[PDB]
Amino acid sequence: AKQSMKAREVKRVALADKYFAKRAELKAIISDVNARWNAVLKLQTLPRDSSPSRQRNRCRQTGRPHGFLRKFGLSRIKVREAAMRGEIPGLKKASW
Amino acid sequence: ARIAGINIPDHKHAVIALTSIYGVGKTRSKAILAAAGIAEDVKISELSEGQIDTLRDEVAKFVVEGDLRREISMSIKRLMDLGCYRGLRHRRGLPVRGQRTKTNARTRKGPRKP
C-alpha cells in the first residue's frame, strides 16, 4: 500500500528507538514533582517521529493500516490466507 | 422557610427542599445539613427558627442565586466577547463541547425548523 508509506513507517521506527526509550527518560523522570524550570517540557524539539505513538502497526506483508492483528503481525486478509494454507502453526477453524 | 432568597420550600425532607436553591444540588445540601448539624430527613415543618437561620448562615457561604446567575452570565459574556471558538459557538446557538451537529444537536439547537 503505497511504498512511500511503508518507508515512512520504517523512518518512524528508526527514530523511535534512536531518540526515545533513551530521552523519553525526560518525560518519565523530569516531568515530575521534584522542583521548577520550564526547560525539559521545551526539550521536546526531538524530531516528533521519535514519538512511539506515531507508529501505525501496518501489515507486515502488505502494509495495510486497518485490520491489523498484533499476535500475527498481519492484516486480517493475510491472516486468513496464511491460516488456511497452514503456515500459521496451531491455528485452525474454531467452533464451540 | 424563606432561605437564601425568596426561595420558600417546605413539606419535604431537608436534603431535597434545599435543592430548590439555585446552586445547591445533593452534595452541597448534604454539606449544609452536616455543617449546620441537622439530620438529613427532617422537614422544614418540624424544624425550629434558630435552626432555620443556622441553615441561612450555612447557605450564605457558597455562591448561590443572584451571584451565581450573574457569575454564569458573566462567564458566557466573556466568551462571546472574546470571539473564541467557544464564543462564536456559544453565540450562534450550536453545541460547544465538540459534539455532533450533522444530526442530534437538538437541545442546544432547538426543535426542528421546517
Binding site: 516531568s31 520550564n38 517540557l41 521545551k42 524539539t45 | 466573556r78 472574546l82 470571539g83 473564541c84 471558538y85 467557544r86 462564536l88
Partner: protein, 79 residues
Amino acid sequence: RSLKKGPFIDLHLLKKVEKAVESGDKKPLRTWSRRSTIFPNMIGLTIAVHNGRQHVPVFVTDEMVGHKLGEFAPTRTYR
C-alpha cells in the same frame, strides 16, 4: 482541560515572543503553532494564527491568557 504540569507553547514561539517584546511590537507573527497557550508577556502583540489556509491576525487582550492560540482562528467557514 489538560496538563497538571506546565502549560504549553512551542519553543520557536517562545523565542519569537521574547524577541517580539524586546524590540517592540512591530509586525504580526506568522504562527502555525495553534497548540500554544497564550502567556501574559504576549499581551499587546499581533500574532497571526494559521487556520489551514490563511494567517489571521489575533490581537492579544489581557483575558486571552488562559487559552490556546487556535481558539481565535476559526478553521471552518460556515455561512
